[PDB]
Amino acid sequence: MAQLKGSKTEENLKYAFAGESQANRRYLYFASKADVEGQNDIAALFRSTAEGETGHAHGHLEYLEAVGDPATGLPFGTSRQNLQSAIAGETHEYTDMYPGMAKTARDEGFEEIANWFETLAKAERSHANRYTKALDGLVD
Amino acid sequence: AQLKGSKTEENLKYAFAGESQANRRYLYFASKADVEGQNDIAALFRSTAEGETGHAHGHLEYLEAVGDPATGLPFGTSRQNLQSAIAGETHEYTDMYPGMAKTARDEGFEEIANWFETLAKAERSHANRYTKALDGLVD
Ligand SMILES: [Fe+3]
Ligand SMILES: [Fe+3]
Ligand SMILES: [Fe+3]
Secondary structure, X not given: OHHHOOOHHXXXXXXXXXXXXXXXXXXXXXXXXXXXXXXXXXXXXHHHHHXXXXXXXXXXXXXXXXXXXXXXXXXXXXXXXXXXXXXXXXXXXXXXXHHHHHHHHHHHOOHHHHHHHHHHHHHHHHHHHHHHHHHHOOOO | OOOOOOHHHHHHHHHHHHHHHHHHHHHHHHHHHHHHOOHHHHHXXXXXXXXXXXXXXXXXXXXXXXXXXXXXXXXXXXXXXHHHHHHHHHHHHHHHHHHHHHHHHHOOOHHHHHHHHHHHHHHHHHHHHXXXXXXXXXX
16 A cells, blocks of 8 residues: 555556556457457457456556555545545546647648647536535435 | 657557556446445446546547557557567566565565566467467468
8 A cells, every 4th residue: 555655666557557548449449350350259248348448457457556546646445535536536537638739730831730739628528517516415 | 640659659658658547447336336235336447438438448549540658569469469469478478577576675675575476477378379370370
């Protein structure tokens, strides 16, 4: 638990959590590509492996509960804590991250990617708003 | 304008990492809600997680033009995807997880060291299954 704070192992858990999260997403993408190809056994293999990566990421997050949410630095655990962290993250995404990435895409000559980032800014704003209403009505 | 070597390429990789993590985080939060009996909050975290799956999917579609953010290798076809997955998993079981276990043991986190060692063994097994699948792929 707490002796983790400020260690290299803390940073390794965060890195491994990021890698495992991405591995799940990547393997599900690969599974859908296998679906389209009619490669049903390969698809099923990707999905089974992706499920293993979910368990791995879950374990990393269990350990990180001692130090804070890797996306925000905020405590996590209870639903009130979780909503507060998700709100903070989402708010940062819609106010700064995606609009900044949109502007840069546009200025580099990637109009469609800029429009995509703007679509995502709108999406995260809707997430942040829904989470806030949920927290506002929470009875714990 | 070429995506390869652009600031936008790097931003798509970063955004992909963020979106991937957001889905894992929100699913974890959904399980905490389930245990507390906050079933409406659980459903909101799951719904939101599904949105983040879409976002990650779209970032990956753009990154197909440049390479797999985990390995730098091409992806698209099952042959390419297996090859990339094998390369990533091999890095994790030979280098990443053993390095992390050594640091954890050195810092006195013995349980965590063993966790990373267990994961190294799991990724080796992943690599081996993907290699078998690639070997018999009808392509
Ligand atoms: Fe894993
Ligand atoms: Fe969101
Ligand atoms: Fe998102």
